[PDB]
Design a protein around this nucleic acid. Sequence first.
RNA 1: CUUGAGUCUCGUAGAGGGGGGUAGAAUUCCAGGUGUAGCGGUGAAAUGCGUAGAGAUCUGGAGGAAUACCGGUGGCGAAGGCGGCCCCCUGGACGAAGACUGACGCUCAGGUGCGAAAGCGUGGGGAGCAAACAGGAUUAGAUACCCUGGUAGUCCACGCCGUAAACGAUGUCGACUUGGAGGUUGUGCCCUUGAGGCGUGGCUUCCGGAGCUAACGCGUUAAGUCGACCGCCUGGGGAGUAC
Lengths: 74, 88, 70, 128, 135
Amino acid sequence: ARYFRRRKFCRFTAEGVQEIDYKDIATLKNYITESGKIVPSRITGTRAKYQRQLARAIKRARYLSLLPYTDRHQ
Amino acid sequence: SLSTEATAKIVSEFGRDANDTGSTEVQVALLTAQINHLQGHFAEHKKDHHSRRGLLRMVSQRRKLLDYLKRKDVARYTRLIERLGLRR
Amino acid sequence: PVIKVRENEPFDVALRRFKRSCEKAGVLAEVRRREFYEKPTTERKRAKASAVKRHAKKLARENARRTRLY
Amino acid sequence: AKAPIRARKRVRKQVSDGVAHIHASFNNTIVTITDRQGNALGWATAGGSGFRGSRKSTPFAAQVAAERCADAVKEYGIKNLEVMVKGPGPGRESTIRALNAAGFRITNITDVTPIPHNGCRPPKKRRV
Amino acid sequence: MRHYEIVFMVHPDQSEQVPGMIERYTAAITGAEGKIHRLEDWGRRQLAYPINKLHKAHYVLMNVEAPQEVIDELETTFRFNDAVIRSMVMRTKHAVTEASPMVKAKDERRERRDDFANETADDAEAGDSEEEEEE
RNA sequence: CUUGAGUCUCGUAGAGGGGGGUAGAAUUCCAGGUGUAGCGGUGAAAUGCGUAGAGAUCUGGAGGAAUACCGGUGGCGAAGGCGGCCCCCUGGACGAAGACUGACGCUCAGGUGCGAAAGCGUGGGGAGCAAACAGGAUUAGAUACCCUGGUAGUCCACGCCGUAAACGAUGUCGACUUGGAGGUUGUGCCCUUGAGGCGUGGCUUCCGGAGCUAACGCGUUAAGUCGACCGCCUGGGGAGUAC
């Protein structure tokens, strides 16, 4: 049926997690090393835009203590 | 940027009674309300120069459509500038 | 720069490949070196720049089939 | 300084676990064994191996620094280990082998080498 | 009107302050004809890092719509609220009022990982069970 | 008149501008804990710090520049220029339907506004690093280089002449010229068969054809074919000084 838009096996082999929502802790740790910082868009194969917005939403999240800012907090 | 209801008030009072935005008197009156709000902001915020560039744009297109209007009808022109309380 | 991300199965030799994702690069690499403001945008961000030698190689593969070197 | 002591048997507090700290520079390694709560139980260095130059700052001098200190603390009675690593210099892995060779487990190799939020400006050095 | 999604947490022991603060924050927003489209409390959570000491805090998503002048007075209040340790409010572009990503984790926190204490009962008096002054 | 351009509401991508809020990490600092003989620097080395207890290390607070991360061929500005996250005021550009005006156009001497960088007056701020300065090291000479000590400075706010290699050293805006594809986004269509495919706009980029170059190179974002108008150059040295 028409306008299905991500039924199956289309856009990406690897799934996109969030954009600008920032309220779940487990979705954000998808892009955080143990050194405590956001991963480049070449490694994940995000299109750059979706990453520039996430970069703000994760930083916003970090500053609210959902996430570690530094390796020293492991 | 202007409020929806300010944009409808300009259209009611200026141009013809068709309530278009397209015409030379009403484009001059729609620019005008935005120049006047920006000169409100710029009562303070005195280091904000790269946006002040935007005032000199809004002003300059208004100088071009009042230049056009005065090559045409003197009634529309002399009525507008005093009815719209414009310049000094 | 043994890098804080833990190596799959711990051993005396750190698995430096499996560890880094964006650590040390640009931040702790230019140690005892002069800091520039805007040069890093074109100086360090060289991911397109390094792909070209791989592309050149992937092009010459095809030509070796057409020449009968392959 | 050191004394000529008879063969060692001695007991101190038999604490069983520790943290090690490895402070790696360009000219040296400082290798320092602590209690988990964080108190020096002893240290050794690469520079007292008296190589001079660049040669003091090689993985084999990093190894033997680790082996002196890990040894001395057998009187403190440590049996398991963890390490924090703090510098970009060499002995990445060969220091880790000497802590294991002291007969300790060394499963947690946490690099903590601090990345300030763009901190204090470094000496300019060579004009390239 | 424009929508501003406020999320904040409070130092456990200081939570007894907030049931007084929320009833004012709602009286200034519905006093400006705004709306609260949920106001969900998630319960007490582990911080990744301490803020003003302690490794725990209690997390609240207020989910406001308000005209812009009122939100401007509210971020300054909430940032300088002494009981609040930190707070974030996000931009209008692509903003949600439904189907929360933390719906399970909220239930897990409230059910199990919580404080279980009197100082977070007060927090729940600021939570979904919101009580607010009359306009 | 629309075939040029201009305007209203809708949508979109981004570190554009100006004022507010806000956390944590190293050096640096105060206090307390633990602890013994070197640390630092480099070709190698000395000056430097240390038994008056250094060096390293742990705990808690402190302060300020700064914000490590968006990091990619991305996006924005004015070239130079812009990167923590939020809020307030707000510019400029990219799309799309409905709709309106109807050459309202191009260029711009003069012109007023506006700084990469340091320079800089008062206020604020000051942690490290550093020209000079000092001494070691070189003999290789200038206190330079190189190393250690070490100050103005760097940092913010407002303010003064806006400097350069001032940038795609490619003026402005507009018309015309085989295209495919990357990056990635409005939006029409698709099981969105893979940062995928086609319709049609968007900046941004790889390849190469017509044309253009001394040569590299450019090539639909020209350095092509052109349009008007403005800006600037006319052998070296001596002069970015002199007048």
